[PDB]
Amino acid sequence: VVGMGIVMSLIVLAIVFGNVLVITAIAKFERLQTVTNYFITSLACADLVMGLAVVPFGAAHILTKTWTFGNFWCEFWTSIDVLCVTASIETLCVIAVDRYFAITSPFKYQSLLTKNKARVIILMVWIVSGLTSFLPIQMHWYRATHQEAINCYAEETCCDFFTNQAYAIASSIVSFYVPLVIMVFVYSRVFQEAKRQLQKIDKSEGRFHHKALKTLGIIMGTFTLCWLPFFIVNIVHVIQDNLIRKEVYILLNWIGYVNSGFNPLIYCRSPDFRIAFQEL
Amino acid sequence: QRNEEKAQREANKKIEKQLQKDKQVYRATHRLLLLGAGESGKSTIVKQMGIFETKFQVDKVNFHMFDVGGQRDERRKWIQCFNDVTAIIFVVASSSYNMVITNRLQEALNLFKSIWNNRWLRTISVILFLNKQDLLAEKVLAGKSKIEDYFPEFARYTTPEDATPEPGEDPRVTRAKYFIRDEFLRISTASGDGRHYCYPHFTCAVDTENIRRVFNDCRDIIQRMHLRQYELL
Amino acid sequence: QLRQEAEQLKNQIRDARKACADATLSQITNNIDPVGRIQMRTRRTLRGHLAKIYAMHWGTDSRLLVSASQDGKLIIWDSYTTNKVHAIPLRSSWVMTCAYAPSGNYVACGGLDNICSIYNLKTVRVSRELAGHTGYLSCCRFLDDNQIVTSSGDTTCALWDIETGQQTTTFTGHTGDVMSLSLAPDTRLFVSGACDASAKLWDVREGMCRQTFTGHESDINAICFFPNGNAFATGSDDATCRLFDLRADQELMTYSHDNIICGITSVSFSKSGRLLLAGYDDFNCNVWDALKADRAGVLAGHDNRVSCLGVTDDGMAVATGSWDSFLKIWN
Amino acid sequence: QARKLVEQLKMEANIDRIKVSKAAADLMAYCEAHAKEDPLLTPVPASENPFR
Ligand SMILES: Nc1nc2c(ncn2[C@@H]2O[C@H](COP(=O)(O)OP(=O)(O)OP(=O)(O)O)[C@@H](O)[C@H]2O)c(=O)[nH]1
Ligand SMILES: CN[C@@H]1CCc2c(ccc(O)c2O)[C@H]1O
């Protein structure tokens, strides 16, 4: 337990530093303010909120093995967890669809995406995440019914997660399983277009004269490896009881959290962004 | 007092609204620059489809062409203004290898090399039209003139394996056409690396497929730019 | 025959120039106190242009100014409150210069259409079109309410009559494109720098060339009179500036640095004639010392190449324009 | 065309020229005399600055 605090103190610092740097670099310089960069700001805001108001309280609760903040703060913390996770995941699908539209139809891309439409889309995404998280949890439509659930809800010092079979399925479907297929289809089409363009170039100037695969592999693999096992066990532990332990659940959930710190290292590797970072 | 301030604010609001309205029209049009050597056929190719500008629409897309013919200086100090165009159209008469006017193709090649290697024009692609195909075929069929007299390297040149000659093409006319196209592509490929490319076409004065060719080339140009921006290409 | 006589005359001129160089400006100004450190901060930023900017001219009242952009617009600002006053749409989208009349009644324009156009502000509509040049316009300046001097790319300059649209006189002698000009304070002479690395001192009343200076090594992009009227400065694309004297008829000082390799797009003096502000291709502006040739400040608030630069008549502010479609007022 | 150039050089050859020291002294005197009324040289108080 001595080194656990040391290792968990670095995650908060990394998340906060990366997201603060990204937000400050976007806000300070006018040349970086485009339509595409609006979604990155929302993703950074969600990751920053997760790094600030989620990781420290969870780490303290794990270390002390007791929730010393009554019963209101446990529910508020759970609502914030769900809200931040959903709002972070949906922005990746938004960005993927944006790139799909930008590459597949280049003539109509300028007219399709505007500042007002981007703002409307971001507001809709955040509203949907809030409806998924805050509305059911605070209205007590997610609690379970077994004796252990009642006992843990009664205790003020105990704050554990118990849900009914329908809520887990609905939340997993809304948060993870719907964006995944959309992103897979989008990136398949993008890879096809890139391959076609490369073939045309080679057929044109082949006599005188890998990147897409690596980029797509990074983008898909990071997200899938970070968030896939948790949303499998989230249904496994309700379908088949007495099959999933608590420590495994916590470990997979925390593996999911650290994906919020890797985001600035994937969506902000641009010469303009690097120059902006250097100027700071 | 505030009486002048209110009128100033109203005028500023009206001007800003007009500018916002005009920005949408400005951002959804494509500008093209038309260049060519002397007697190459710029006027004939533009009529079929200080300064001269034409506007045409294909597939509900707005296009806007320019033809700078008012200035005929050997140097081009006005070439730095056209550093934000979609593409450049270069027209050359490929059937003028025996006109002294160094012959004409040498001057055209030098002009193409100078345009390609320019500080401001380092991210603009070129659509290349090799005009006057029928005259080139007629010259090749006749034995009066030989290309090796003016271009010695043609003697050791051989037709590339990847070719698409039409049924009416003789083995010699195809060889000459591909020799000239390769002569241009050799200069094209050496200088740039991924930033901008060249699109060569064989054109005469009776075909009416040039608008489709420009449309497809511009679509490819924008698609490649977007692919390269995201590091997918 | 004639060529030998021309060479002999050139040698005689060169020998005559060398006999009058008793001392140097750098030697005389050794004991004067240095200007020190000068720092300028942006006060206003103007937005509204959809494309890059080439031209800008201050008003006589030191409050209004005009600007021209590639999108085909001509906007008049109010630097005190940042309020757009006018927006004139242009027939041709390729504009390269603009000017603002001394009385504020009219504004001129020109570009790649080989035509100079005058607009009546206090009537906005086109008032007169001047044609006859066979090359793109590079500059235009108002002598008074009824006269204007223009230069074009056909190696000639002309003096126009707006009322009738006729060239009163024409100036010839350059072997390259004329790139800029500037009028004397009393409006009796003017200078023009061309693309053959030479500048000449013309006479408006007579119509003849009086002096020629050939100190540079490449194209000349900018020119500006000293406030006194007995000197001027030029800026070429070889990253050098030079100060010429009319009476001594030779170069006095050179403003160059070893860390600058980019070209110069515009120059301008100050109210007292002590500072010299020059814009460069490396996205920033440098401030020199006229009597020392020592750099004394840098203005680095732009994100693209600086194309124009101007100082107000009262010497209260400096305006700059760039290719990112933004103007900035420094103080 | 050569005759015109010869005439131009002949006209330009006969011009009086003054000492470089005199011109430098005149420029220095003008700069020194008009140094007080230069808002860009000596910064102006913020009371009389219309841009701030
Ligand atoms: N026989 C034949 N002549 C052609 C063909 N294409 C172009 N031409 C020549 O083109 C000429 C028509 O004038 P343009 O092609 O516009 O030449 P231009 O007006 O001088 O154009 P620029 O030199 O670029 O300014 C005719 O006299 C033809 O000789 C062709 O396919 N067949
Ligand atoms: C306690 N951590 C929570 C538990 C369940 C859950 C999470 C995230 C998104 C969801 O849709 C969920 O249902 C996890 O972050």
Swiss-Prot record, chain A:
Keywords assigned by UniProt, alphabetized: Cell membrane, Disulfide bond, Endosome, G-protein coupled receptor, Glycoprotein, Golgi apparatus, Hydroxylation, Lipoprotein, Membrane, Palmitate, Phosphoprotein, Receptor, Transducer, Transmembrane, Transmembrane helix, Ubl conjugation
Transmembrane segments: 3-26, 40-63, 75-97, 119-142, 165-188, 216-239, 247-270
Family, as annotated: Belongs to the G-protein coupled receptor 1 family. Adrenergic receptor subfamily. ADRB2 sub-subfamily.
Organism lineage: Eukaryota, Metazoa, Chordata, Craniata, Vertebrata
Protein name: Beta-2 adrenergic receptor
Disulfide bridge partners, by residue number: 74-159, 152-158
Protein's GO biological process: adenylate cyclase-activating adrenergic receptor signaling pathway; adenylate cyclase-modulating G protein-coupled receptor signaling pathway; adrenergic receptor signaling pathway; AMPA selective glutamate receptor signaling pathway; bone resorption; brown fat cell differentiation; cell surface receptor signaling pathway; cellular response to amyloid-beta
Residues holding (S)-carazolol: 81, 171, 253
Effect of residue 47 to N: Affects binding of catecholamines, and produces an uncoupling between the receptor and stimulatory G proteins
GO cellular component: apical plasma membrane; ciliary basal body; cilium; clathrin-coated endocytic vesicle membrane; early endosome; endosome; endosome membrane; Golgi apparatus
UniProt main location, coarse: membrane
Residues annotated to bind (S)-timolol: 81, 86, 234, 253, 257
Membrane side Extracellular: residue ranges: 64-74, 143-164, 240-246
Residues of the full protein shown: 33 to 339 of 413
UniProtKB/Swiss-Prot annotation, chain B:
Sequence ranges of Basic and acidic residues compositional bias: 1-12
Chain positions found as Phosphoserine: 191
Species of provenance: Homo sapiens (Human)
Region listing for G3 motif, in residue ranges: 63-72
Quaternary organization: Heterotrimeric G proteins are composed of 3 units; alpha, beta and gamma. The alpha chain contains the guanine nucleotide binding site. Component of the TAS2R14-GNAS2 complex, consisting of TAS2R14, GNAS2, GNB1 and GNG2; within the complex interacts with TAS2R14; this complex plays a role in the perception of bitterness. Interacts with CRY1; the interaction may block GPCR-mediated regulation of cAMP concentrations. Interacts with ADCY5 and stimulates its adenylyl cyclase activity. Interacts with ADCY6 and stimulates its adenylyl cyclase activity. Interacts with ADCY2.
Function of the molecule: Guanine nucleotide-binding proteins (G proteins) function as transducers in numerous signaling pathways controlled by G protein-coupled receptors (GPCRs). The alpha chain contains the guanine nucleotide binding site and alternates between an active, GTP-bound state and an inactive, GDP-bound state. Signaling by an activated GPCR promotes GDP release and GTP binding. The alpha subunit has a low GTPase activity that converts bound GTP to GDP, thereby terminating the signal. Both GDP release and GTP hydrolysis are modulated by numerous regulatory proteins.
Effect of residue 71 to R: In somatotrophinoma
Gene transcribed to yield this protein: GNAS
One record GO biological process: cellular response to prostaglandin E stimulus
From Swiss-Prot, chain C:
Sorted UniProt keywords: Acetylation, Disease variant, Host-virus interaction, Intellectual disability, Phosphoprotein, Repeat, Transducer, WD repeat
InterPro entries to which the protein is assigned, alphabetical: G-protein_beta_WD-40_rep, Gprotein_B, Guanine_nucleotide-bd_bsu, WD40/YVTN_repeat-like_dom_sf, WD40_repeat_CS, WD40_repeat_dom_sf, WD40_rpt
GO biological process: adenylate cyclase-activating dopamine receptor signaling pathway; cell population proliferation; cellular response to catecholamine stimulus; cellular response to prostaglandin E stimulus; G protein-coupled acetylcholine receptor signaling pathway; G protein-coupled receptor signaling pathway; phospholipase C-activating G protein-coupled receptor signaling pathway; Ras protein signal transduction
GO molecular function: GTPase activity; GTPase binding; protein-containing complex binding; signaling receptor complex adaptor activity
SUPFAM superfamilies in the cross-refs: WD40 repeat-like
One Gene Ontology cellular component: plasma membrane
Source organism superkingdom: Eukaryota
Phenotypic consequence of residue 25 to F: In MRD42; uncertain significance; no effect on protein abundance; no effect on complex formation with gamma subunit; no effect on trimer formation with alpha and gamma subunits; no effect on receptor-driven G protein activation
Entry comment on modification after translation: Phosphorylation at His-257 by NDKB contributes to G protein activation by increasing the high energetic phosphate transfer onto GDP.
Modified residues (Phosphohistidine): 257
Record's keyword annotation contains Iron-sulfur: no
Repeat region (WD), residues: 41-89, 90-131, 132-172, 173-214, 215-258, 259-300, 301-331
Gene (UniProt): GNB1
UniProtKB/Swiss-Prot annotation, chain D:
Keyword flag Transmembrane helix: no
Keywords, sorted A to Z: Acetylation, Cell membrane, Host-virus interaction, Lipoprotein, Membrane, Methylation, Prenylation, Transducer
Bilayer topology annotation: Lipid-anchor
Annotated compartments: Cell membrane
Principal location: membrane
Main function: Guanine nucleotide-binding proteins (G proteins) are involved as a modulator or transducer in various transmembrane signaling systems. The beta and gamma chains are required for the GTPase activity, for replacement of GDP by GTP, and for G protein-effector interaction.
Organism expressing this protein natively: Homo sapiens
Entire-sequence positions represented here: 11 to 62 of 71
GO cellular component: extracellular exosome; heterotrimeric G-protein complex; membrane; plasma membrane; synapse
Protein name in the entry: Guanine nucleotide-binding protein G(I)/G(S)/G(O) subunit gamma-2
Subunit structure: G proteins are composed of 3 units, alpha, beta and gamma. In this context, interacts with GNB2. The heterodimer formed by GNB1 and GNG2 interacts with ARHGEF5. The heterodimer formed by GNB1 and GNG2 interacts with GRK2. Forms complexes with TAS2R14 and G-proteins; these complexes play a role in the perception of bitterness. Component of the TAS2R14-GNAI1 complex, consisting of TAS2R14, GNAI1, GNB1 and GNG2. Component of the TAS2R14-GNAT3 complex, consisting of TAS2R14, GNAT3, GNB1 and GNG2. Component of the TAS2R14-GNAS2 complex, consisting of TAS2R14, GNAS2, GNB1 and GNG2.
Coiled coil: none
GO molecular function: G-protein beta-subunit binding
Source superkingdom: Eukaryota
